[PDB]
């Protein structure tokens, strides 16, 4: 029926599935219960403070559910048996997994992806190593425990009358073996129990995601009112595609799913092309091929000009090789798990991939193209192993006069000189010796957001509390002065006594990529010569053509949405004459290891800074500091850490050589491995088949030296693309001379590790096309690198660019974003700001093809217990919250559980709820929006459960600063004396000047206070503040709960500075006049009907985005400055320009900005922009509360200049900040008006002529502009024009 009603009826059944009996009503805002704990009792039992027998008496009575503490009922969770003990089930999926159970006596000790190893009682120390490996591999931390995830699927599957196979095999596992792992609810990383395989958490994540993806697509087929998915002529159900794939990826999930990824993505990307009638979506834009100003048209079906080209030697070899990548993968699964199933559904599809058409104008074909790209996320995040392998530089390609390796170097070298000239023409050069120490922290901090590095440090703090290294960007406020000295620069890292350490972090699907953590003695000499390349290429505006000679437009590095950022793929795939060649390099970074790149790059930057020869940094010339950053032996010999290469022997070989040749202390030995002193005696006696022990070397293989272009460098993303442009422009040369007149090149563009051209293929002949395609692959092989024919595509109607797929002028989307796991253990210290991001995540998910009704239910599942279990205190039955005292009857079975109401996702923000709307996800609900949504007469059936629970929401968590555990005198001020702007440094030379400037409205930013706010800003991180003030907030959260009232009120306006979007309730809003009746066109199909009807009746964004408020206009222009934007905001600069009164001259405005530690090059535009907007400026700000920060809203036409003229009609006597709150109310109301099916009318602000209700508007506008609390402090000037204009206009 409704969404809020049947959503809450299922969530109430989940908690009565997660707990045996709990009287959870809807009308209550929260339910409070207690849980039993025994470990913290047993510590008290060791000290001997007892009254009553705790263990047996409490546990028996909890199972009989009679007893309760302080009136609040106390109970435990349901066991792992009873989650799926309501029904029994047997399945072949569980019989495959128990056949894939491998004993201890088969394992390889350093596989990159784990197999299914059996747990055994009285386990040996090598099975303890697998227990060490399993605890470090399959960490499934996240939002919600995996047990109550399974109660959600079990509850949902009974309602939709469909049984997913992920639920089937889990129910087949539960009744045989009871509980695979005991996971905690307070933290989500702890788990210690392990039944028949270690891979049971990675199994249960793979089983839940197979259940969610089936509940997605069966619900989506109901939404488009179809019973099957069509592929050309035939029909296949997509549940059969998942079930054959889940069986295949079962016996080794993290290796089989990784290798099936390339034939799956290639199959969709070659589906529609080659068919004889081809339907496209017509679109036209600028004459450049990289034009983003695309508007769209109707559909049409053209004949195919390339209908005969696909019977060539290229396309027949590419499909044959992609079949072998499947056939090598499935035959690997035949041997491991003893099953004889050969994946017959998908292989029938791919046999005729170039022939059968794909038409986007049907819903059935668009769903299947997006379904096969979403099937890759079935195994969760990829936690892997990498062995530390050296360069093995005895096998890389020598510079021969046969191949073109030396021409890569001279063309890489030239492109660096061109980039430094084009940045010099755009006033970006390297930083001078005057400004070295003042730009050092600027570039080290904002490239730490780009590529973060490491240097060990002792971070000390006093009021006696010691903090560890805490690897962040504030390290250079401690040792910023001595990193650039004589002895710190002259050390090389090939010796054993000093080295650098690799760091590992996982990705959503791929292998786990390691990040190099380079020292500061090699980064800050590398950082100074990289600077004009970083800021210049972030200017995204450029024109791409090979006959144009400007490097700034071709290479792109890295407005929010990906539909408006990749509209070139939607235009060029619609053209019948564009034949894109997009290559990719398998094993790219290992072929940057050759001297073709690094020696070519190094002599480029030497000759480029040769005009800067005379200037010196503390006596160091540019040639000396270019060697301190790169080094002829620094990166040529850098010892890097990682896990050490470990062998496996027998214990008889160990006992006779133990005390003779085994040491400890140099490098750390893993948990279940035995050590050995050297590596020469390790590999000598190494071979065994029983492998009764495992050895690992500590000082023989000291570390692993590599000469590889590191990802930890500052020049990583730039120099990967200059070499990519150099290999690209030789491919332009050789193809033009080998086959002249064929395959002209209209545009090119280069990102790191990919290459894309938009070419006009001239001749349609198979005998001459393979002469072209073989000349491409031989040119890239002569350039040292290696290209793969099974991944490189040359096809007319299919364009892909950086994980953005487009086919025939339409959008084939993918959602590989995970919902369960993450790359770090998620702390929920700000719960209200957490699920606000989780709503905006699922908006991007539903815009990429997810179901609306299912993604609504996941967010109602989260909002009950995102922040439940983090309690340590006990409450009274008389509505009182206290800290519990350590007594005998208060320490046993006492942890509070707070289950929130599932309708807290619709109570608006500021009323302790989250602002999602039940009609659409991309609409947020503010305080005034709840008043208008209950006012519309057709929301009463939907918003009936939200109306009865609006104010009953208990408040959430927050982390604030404290006067305790705050200031330390000397940690930052050591480097803060050596670092200030020259405007700031002159103020610190005379104490009379520092007294004249604190009288200015700098206030909290005076030159005696700028140091102290800079240190309190650095200490917002985890290990110093959040781990220390965790004791503080629990004593402050109890105060906020007892002081919380259940009366709520919508307030017009806000505090005396800012206004909200609730300013629009000052006037009446009517709806007059029909606009039109034309449904718009858009390239993105596969949208839910709550999202389709907004994109239908309101078109996409064809114009540029509006510059709406003053506050967002500052943050665009404060973005050019670097340090302060991470610390100071647009709020504090706007109060300085408010407290200054009327702005009197431009030169007075620039000198107060540079006194606020702002860069001189950016402060001159601030004073030019603000003194042009002086006559329209008013003393007001704006709190948007994020009504357009999502991806789907920025893809729409709304909140632009042309939107306001054709929908809004406001009176002329409104100041610009008041206009912005009106138009931001307008874009939300016209979105809700379209999502309901209501006719689109032009809304107009309505004010009558009687003075009895005109005076109340006149009193309120004087109250908002000139508040009473701001005039008593002497802040409002009477000489402002918009303050004088308000009194005369409205009466």
């Amino acid at each position: 029926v409704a969404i809020t009603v049947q959503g809450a009826q299922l969530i109430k059944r989940v908690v009565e599935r997660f707990y045996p009996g709990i009287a959870f009503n809807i009308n209550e805002g929260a339910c409070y219960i207690y849980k039993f704990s025994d470990h913290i009792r047993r510590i008290r039992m060791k000290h001997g403070t007892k009254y009553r027998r705790q263990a047996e008496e409490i546990i028996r009575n909890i199972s009989l559910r009679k007893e309760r503490l302080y009136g609040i009922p106390v109970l435990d969770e349901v066991e792992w048996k009873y989650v799926f003990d309501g029904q029994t089930f047997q399945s072949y999926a569980f019989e495959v997994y128990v056949n894939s159970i491998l004993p201890w006596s088969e394992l390889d000790p350093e596989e990159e992806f784990l197999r299914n190893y059996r747990v055994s009682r009285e386990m040996t120390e090598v099975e303890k190593f697998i227990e060490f490996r399993a605890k470090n591999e399959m960490q499934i931390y996240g939002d919600i425990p995996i047990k109550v995830w399974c109660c959600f699927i079990n509850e949902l599957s009974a309602e939709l009358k469909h049984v997913p196979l992920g639920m089937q095999v889990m129910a087949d596992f539960v009744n045989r073996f009871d509980s695979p792992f005991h996971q905690g609810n307070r933290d989500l990383s702890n788990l210690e129990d392990f039944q028949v395989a270690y891979t049971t958490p990675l199994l249960f994540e793979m089983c839940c995601m197979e259940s969610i993806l089936e509940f997605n697509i069966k619900m989506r087929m109901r939404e488009e009112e179809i019973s099957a998915l069509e592929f050309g002529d035939m029909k296949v159900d997509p549940v059969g595609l998942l079930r054959e794939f889940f069986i295949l990826c079962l016996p080794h999930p993290k290796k089989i799913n990784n290798v099936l990824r390339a034939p799956y993505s290639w199959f969709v990307k070659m589906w529609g092309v080659g068919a004889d009638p081809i339907v496209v979506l017509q679109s036209t834009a600028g004459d450049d091929r990289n034009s983003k100003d695309v508007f769209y048209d109707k559909f049409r079906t053209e004949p195919n000009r390339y209908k005969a080209l696909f019977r060539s030697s290229f396309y027949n070899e590419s499909r044959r090789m992609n079949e072998e990548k499947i056939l090598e993968a499935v035959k690997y699964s035949q041997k491991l798990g003893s099953h004889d199933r050969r994946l017959p559904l998908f292989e029938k599809m791919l046999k005729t991939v170039y022939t059968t058409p794909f038409y986007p104008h049907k819903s059935s074909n668009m769903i299947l193209a997006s379904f096969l790209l979403s099937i890759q996320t079935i195994t969760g995040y990829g936690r892997a192993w990498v062995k530390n392998v050296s360069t093995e530089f005895d096998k890389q390609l020598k510079p021969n006069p046969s191949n073109l390796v030396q021409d890569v170097s001279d063309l890489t070298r030239e492109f660096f000189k061109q980039a430094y000239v084009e940045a010099k023409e755009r006033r970006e050069e390297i930083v001078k010796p005057e400004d070295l120490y003042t730009s050092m922290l600027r570039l080290a901090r904002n490239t730490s957001s780009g590529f973060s590095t490491e240097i060990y440090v002792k971070k000390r703090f006093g009021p006696l509390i010691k903090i560890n290294s805490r690897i962040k960007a504030l390290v250079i406020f401690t040792k910023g002065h001595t990193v650039f000295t004589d002895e710190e620069l002259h050390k090389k890292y090939n010796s054993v006594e000093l080295y650098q350490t690799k760091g590992s972090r996982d990705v959503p699907i791929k292998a786990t990529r390691t990040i190099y953590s380079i020292n500061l003695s090699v980064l800050v000499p590398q950082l100074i010569v990289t600077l004009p390349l970083n800021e210049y290429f972030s200017r995204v505006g450029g024109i791409t053509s090979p006959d144009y000679k400007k490097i700034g437009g071709k290479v792109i590095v890295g407005t929010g949405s990906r539909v408006m950022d990749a509209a070139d793929c939607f235009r060029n795939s619609a053209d019948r004459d564009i034949f894109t060649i997009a290559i990719d390099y398998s094993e790219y970074d290992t072929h940057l290891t050759r001297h073709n790149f690094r020696t070519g790059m190094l002599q480029g930057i030497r000759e480029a800074m040769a005009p800067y020869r005379d200037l010196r940094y503390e006596g160091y010339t540019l040639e000396q500091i270019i060697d301190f950053g790169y080094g002829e032996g620094r990166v040529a010999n850098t010892l890097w850490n990682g896990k050490r290469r470990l062998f496996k022997t027998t214990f008889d070989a160990y006992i006779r050589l133990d005390e003779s040749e085994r040491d400890k202390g140099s490098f750390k030995v893993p948990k279940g491995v035995l050590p050995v002193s050297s590596v020469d005696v390790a590999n000598r006696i190494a071979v065994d088949k029983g492998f009764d022990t495992l050895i690992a070397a500590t000082d023989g293989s000291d570390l692993a030296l590599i000469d590889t272009h590191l990802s930890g460098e500052n020049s990583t993303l730039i120099a990967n693309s200059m070499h990519n442009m150099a290999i690209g422009t030789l491919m332009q040369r050789e193809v033009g001379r080998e086959q002249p007149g064929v395959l002209t090149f209209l545009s090119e563009q280069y990102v790191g590790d990919d290459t894309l051209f938009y070419t006009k293929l001239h001749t349609t002949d198979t005998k001459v096309f393979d002469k072209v395609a073989a000349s491409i692959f031989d040119t890239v092989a002569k350039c040292g690198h290696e290209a793969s024919p099974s991944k490189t595509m040359m096809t007319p109607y299919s364009v892909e660019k950086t994980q953005t797929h487009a086919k025939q002028g339409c959008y084939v989307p993918q959602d590989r974003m995970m919902i369960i796991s993450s790359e770090r253990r998620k702390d929920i210290e700000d719960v209200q700001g957490y699920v606000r991001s989780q709503v905006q995540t699922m908006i991007t998910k539903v815009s990429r093809g997810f179901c609306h009704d299912l993604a609504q239910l996941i967010l109602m599942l989260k909002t009950t217990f995102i922040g439940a279990w983090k309690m340590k205190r006990t409450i009274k039955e008389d509505a009182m919250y206290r800290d519990r005292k350590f007594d005998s009857n208060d320490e046993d079975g006492f942890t509070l559980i707070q289950i929130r109401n599932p309708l807290a996702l619709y109570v608006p923000i500021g009323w302790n709820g989250y602002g999602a709307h039940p009609a659409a996800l991309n609409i947020v609900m503010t305080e005034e929006m709840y008043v208008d949504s209950i006012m519309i007469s057709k929301l009463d059936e939907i918003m009936a459960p939200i109306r009865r629970i609006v104010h009953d929401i208990p408040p959430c968590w927050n982390e604030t600063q404290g006067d305790k555990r705050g200031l330390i005198s000397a940690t930052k001020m050591s480097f803060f004396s050596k670092m200030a702007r020259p405007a700031v440094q002159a103020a610190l030379s005379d104490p009379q000047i520092i007294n004249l400037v604190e009288e200015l409205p700098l206030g909290e930013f005076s030159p005696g206070r700028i140091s102290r706010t800079m240190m309190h800003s650095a200490l917002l991180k985890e290990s110093s503040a959040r781990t220390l003030l965790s004791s503080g907030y629990e004593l402050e959260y109890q105060k906020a709960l007892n002081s919380w009232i259940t009366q709520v009120s919508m307030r017009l306006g806000e505090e005396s500075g800012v206004i909200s979007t609730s300013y629009a309730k000052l006037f009446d809003v009517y709806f007059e006049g029909e606009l039109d009746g034309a449904p718009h066109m858009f390239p993105d199909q596969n949208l839910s009907p709550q999202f389709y009807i907004q994109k239908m009746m309101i078109g996409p964004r064809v114009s540029s985005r509006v510059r709406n408020s003053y506050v967002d206009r500052i943050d665009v222009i404060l973005r050019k400055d670097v340090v302060m934007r991470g610390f100071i905001t647009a709020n504090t600069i706007l109060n300085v320009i408010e407290k200054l009164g009327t702005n009197h001259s431009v030169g007075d405005l620039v000198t107060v900005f540079t006194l606020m530690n702002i860069e001189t090059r950016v402060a001159e535009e601030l004073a030019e922009y603000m003194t042009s907007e002086k006559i329209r400026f008013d003393a007001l700000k704006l709190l948007k509360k994020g009504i357009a920060g999502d991806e789907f809203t920025m893809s729409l036409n709304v909140a632009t200049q042309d939107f306001i003229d054709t929908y809004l009609a406001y009176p002329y006597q409104l100041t610009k900040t008041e206009v912005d709150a009106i138009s931001l109310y307008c874009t939300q109301m016209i979105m809700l008006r379209a999502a309901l099916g209501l006719p689109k009318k032009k809304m107009k602000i309505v004010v009558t002529d009687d003075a009895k209700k005109r005076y109340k508007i006149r009193l309120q506008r004087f109250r908002t502009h000139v508040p009473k609390i701001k005039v008593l402090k002497k802040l409002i000037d009477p000489n402002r024009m918009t303050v004088r204009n308000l009194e005369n206009q409205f009466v």
Binding site: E223, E225, F299, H361, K362, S363, A919, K938, L939, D940, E941, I942, P1079, P1089, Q1090, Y1092, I1093, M1096, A1235, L1236, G1237
Partner: peptide, 19 residues
């Protein structure tokens, strides 16, 4: 009240208009 079935009727008309 509001019916989620009438919203699809303005979508199944346009999807039939593409055919």
């Amino acid at each position: 009240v509001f019916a989620l079935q009438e919203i699809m009727q303005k979508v199944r008309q346009v999807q039939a208009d593409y055919m």
